[PDB]
Amino acid sequence: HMAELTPILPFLFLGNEQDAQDLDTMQRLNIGYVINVTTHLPLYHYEKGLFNYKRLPATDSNKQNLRQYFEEAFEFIEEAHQCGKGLLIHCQAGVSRSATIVIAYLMKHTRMTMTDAYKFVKGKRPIISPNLNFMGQLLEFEEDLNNGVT
Ligand SMILES: CC(C)(C)C(=O)CSc1ncc2c(n1)-c1cccnc1CC2
């Protein structure tokens, strides 16, 4: 597999589970942190002691709450940021879970509207599968940011 570790920001990369298995590319991009946004995929390289792994144990379903993990993900992204290392956030094909988290990060920490952040991510990673539940959670999150509640 030819991994596509999509650079959203200089240190923030988006990919699927085949991308997350490409050890050589991950090391070449100075990635030091991995967020696995799934309940069931391996921490593929855990036993090599190369990356700081975090699991956000979410399914790609119409009932899954991802909003509950946003702040945890943001803190870990800021750790990689301040450490000068890259972070890969991934789930499965179509990246619905990991792209939602990236979009939320852009909204809160780079002052983007939800629509602009979605279009920004889709401009770099053209295939993003729909999850209407996650769309609604981004919309509630946008409303909360605009009301100063988060
Ligand atoms: C939530 C997630 C990122 C997994 C997706 O569902 C991607 S697919 C898709 N399809 C149609 C729309 C949107 N996303 C969408 C998302 C955010 C803001 N505005 C839109 C406009 C309609």
Side-chain angles (χ1 to χ4, degrees), residues 1 3-150:
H1 176 79
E4 168 60 26
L5 279 50
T6 301
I8 306 310
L9 311 178
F11 60 91
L12 177 62
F13 302 83
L14 172 63
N16 62 37
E17 79 276 56
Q18 295 189 298
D19 305 323
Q21 295 178 69
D22 179 357
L23 187 49
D24 296 338
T25 297
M26 289 167 71
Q27 289 184 295
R28 185 179 62 74
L29 293 168
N30 195 38
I31 281 159
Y33 295 77
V34 176
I35 295 172
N36 176 334
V37 195
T38 70
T39 50
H40 79 298
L41 298 175
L43 312 176
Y44 296 106
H45 314 297
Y46 181 76
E47 257 69 41
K48 292 163 197 306
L50 294 172
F51 311 111
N52 292 133
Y53 273 95
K54 177 179 284 301
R55 181 182 300 273
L56 302 175
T59 66
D60 175 17
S61 64
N62 57 27
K63 72 181 179 316
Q64 175 67 48
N65 176 345
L66 281 188
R67 170 64 176 281
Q68 65 179 312
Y69 296 122
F70 282 5
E71 283 304 325
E72 186 175 0
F74 297 163
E75 288 169 40
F76 203 61
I77 287 165
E78 172 72 357
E79 208 184 311
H81 179 210
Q82 297 294 341
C83 183
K85 292 268 169 173
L87 187 145
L88 168 70
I89 179 167
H90 78 91
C91 51
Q92 288 177 280
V95 298
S96 299
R97 287 167 281 182
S98 51
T100 296
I101 302 288
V102 172
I103 293 164
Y105 176 79
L106 294 176
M107 292 164 59
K108 178 166 181 166
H109 288 289
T110 77
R111 309 285 315 285
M112 303 190 68
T113 67
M114 177 186 59
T115 295
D116 288 344
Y118 168 61
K119 287 179 180 173
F120 182 78
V121 174
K122 196 181 171 65
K124 291 181 173 290
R125 181 95 188 182
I127 301 317
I128 306 173
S129 302
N131 181 310
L132 298 161
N133 165 50
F134 297 163
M135 291 181 208
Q137 292 174 52
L138 290 173
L139 188 67
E140 280 190 348
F141 181 58
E142 186 186 43
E143 184 178 71
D144 290 346
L145 295 168
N146 289 333
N147 291 329
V149 143
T150 164

